């Protein structure tokens, strides 16, 4: 069952083993139960840690209900996949990914004062192809000022660094003007909407670009796995797959009392049930009660 | 889908588009009788004007029924399509059973015949291993968990290089 | 037996969700 804090995340999500648990919880509440006390505790590190480890339990089955658009004609199945992942991030408690990684940027370098360590401490979160170019243009403005560039904003060296890194950003191909005018806003709602109708266009191009990069990586990895697999004779393939399946089955059956092991074994029995149900009536598929 | 929809018996489709099934409706004042004719089947119903808005009160919410996962089914679909692409070029192999007669055996250099019979055994090996379709269910499970860990990011599942680059421009070019 | 249910069949089967639940159950009381 659930422990009164996992069930507060599973309300808006639509994955099956969360929806059936929420439905059994409401079956408990309608049939004469009181709601347990929500904890007014757990100081901020434990709060964001349990957010990190509780949104994981609602995102990780959400990826498996999302089918990859591997090798399809048109960029619109990539838009389907990225929209599904956006909806999964929305139902997982994450924000828009732009403002989410902006929040991570602010969280990472709250204690950085110069601009070289703001490019050092956010090395894991930005592209190294872009981090190398930003470090080299910062070494250029460092050769200009002959002083460490300060990460304050009102410094003239940082102003020249901003006017050079905007050219670096257009050199990467992404327009910094529509993005800065989006997050800086305008007076009237009409010239804010005219900026948003460019920023959302770039935003769609950006998320479909990295989603298409992801499905191209899975396409090439599946092609490499198949081409390393087709070079084997069939008895070696059957022995390797049966031995790997038996070993990872022994790894589950060894864990006695573990909940994940019991769920693993029940899903194995459900897979065998699916094989039996397609074996009984293969004209229509599995037997589903309706 | 939203809970309130706004469609039905207004800008509705008026007729058929295929030769497999026929349909024509009755656009009367208050009511509507459909007449759908499909070969050996015949159906003519009488529906009301508000009988189409009560249709979308309950939602269907169609869902997949997958053996392992919908993601695993998509990866197994791509492995089946790649096995189709390899099977299309094991289908253009030249027929070598026509050169098994003994009038090709004894006119041949012996090592060339050794090479030819070993090439035939190699083709039978390649064809037995490209049509092992039971093994795609365990080939797909080696692509799954690294992908599922990549989508289990600490910032956002749909995150990528370009959106992080754009937000780094937004973080850097503003006043700290 | 056969023809079990619909939401019992909609479950993404070999997703983790429980190993993460195991580590989140044995981590948070050990860190509070």
């Amino acid at each position: 069952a659930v422990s009164k804090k996992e069930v507060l995340y599973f309300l808006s999500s639509k994955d099956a083993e969360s929806s059936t648990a929420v439905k059994s919880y409401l079956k408990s509440l309608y049939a004469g139960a009181q709601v347990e006390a929500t904890e007014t505790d757990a100081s901020e590190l434990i709060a964001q840690l349990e957010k990190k480890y509780l949104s994981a339990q609602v995102v990780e089955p959400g990826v498996h209900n999302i089918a990859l658009p591997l090798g399809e004609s048109g960029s619109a199945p990539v838009k389907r996949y990225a929209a599904e992942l956006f909806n999964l991030g929305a139902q997982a408690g994450f924000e828009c990914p732009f403002i989410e990684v902006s929040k991570k940027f602010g969280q990472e370098t709250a204690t950085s004062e110069t601009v070289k360590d703001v490019l050092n401490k956010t090395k894991s979160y930005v592209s190294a192809d872009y981090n190398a170019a930003l470090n080299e243009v910062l070494s250029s403005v460092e050769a200009e000022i002959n002083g460490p560039v300060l990460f304050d904003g009102k410094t003239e060296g940082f102003k020249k660094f901003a006017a050079k890194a905007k050219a670096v950003a257009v050199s990467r191909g992404l327009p910094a003007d529509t993005i800065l005018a989006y997050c800086a806003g305008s007076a009237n709602e009409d010239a804010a909407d005219k900026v948003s109708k460019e920023f959302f266009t770039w935003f769609e191009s950006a998320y479909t670009a990295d989603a298409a990069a992801e499905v191209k990586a899975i396409e090439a990895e599946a092609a490499s796995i198949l081409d390393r697999h087709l070079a084997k004779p069939v008895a070696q393939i059957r022995k390797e797959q049966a031995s790997a399946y038996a070993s990872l089955l022994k790894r589950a059956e060894t864990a006695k009392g573990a909940k994940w092991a019991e769920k693993y074994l029940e899903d194995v029995k459900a897979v065998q049930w699916f094989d039996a149900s397609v074996a009984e009536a293969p004209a229509s598929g599995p037997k589903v009660a309706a | 889908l939203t809970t309130f929809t706004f469609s039905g018996l207004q800008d509705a489709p008026v007729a058929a588009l295929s030769g497999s099934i026929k349909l024509n409706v009755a656009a009367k004042a208050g009511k509507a009788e459909v007449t759908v004719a499909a070969g050996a089947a015949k159906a003519a119903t009488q529906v009301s004007a508000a009988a189409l808005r009560k249709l979308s009160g309950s939602k269907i919410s169609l869902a997949e029924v997958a053996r392992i996962s919908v993601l695993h089914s998509s990866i197994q679909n791509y492995l089946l399509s790649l096995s189709n692409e390899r099977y299309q070029l094991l289908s253009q192999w030249p027929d070598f059973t026509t050169m098994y007669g003994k009038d090709f055996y004894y006119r041949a250099h012996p090592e060339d015949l050794k090479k030819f019979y070993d090439a035939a055994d190699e083709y039978y090996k390649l064809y037995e291993t490209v049509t092992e379709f039971d093994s795609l269910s365990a080939l797909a499970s080696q692509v799954v968990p690294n992908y599922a860990a990549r989508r289990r990011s600490t910032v956002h599942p749909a995150i990528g290089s370009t959106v992080a680059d754009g937000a780094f421009t937004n973080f850097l070019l503003s006043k700290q | 037996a056969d023809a079990k249910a619909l939401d019992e069949l909609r479950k993404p089967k070999f997703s983790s969700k429980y190993l993460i639940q195991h580590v989140s159950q044995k981590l948070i009381p050990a860190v509070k």
Binding site: L249 | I68, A140 | -
Partner: peptide, 30 residues
């Protein structure tokens, strides 16, 4: 068909490492 279960996070946002194209089509045409 069953995969090993992992519970770990990726904090890095990198390119997804598009792997090498293997030479099976050219070997089979050869």
């Amino acid at each position: 068909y069953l995969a090993p279960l992992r519970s770990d996070f990726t904090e890095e946002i990198t390119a997804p490492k598009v792997a090498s194209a293997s030479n099976l089509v050219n070997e089979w045409n050869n």
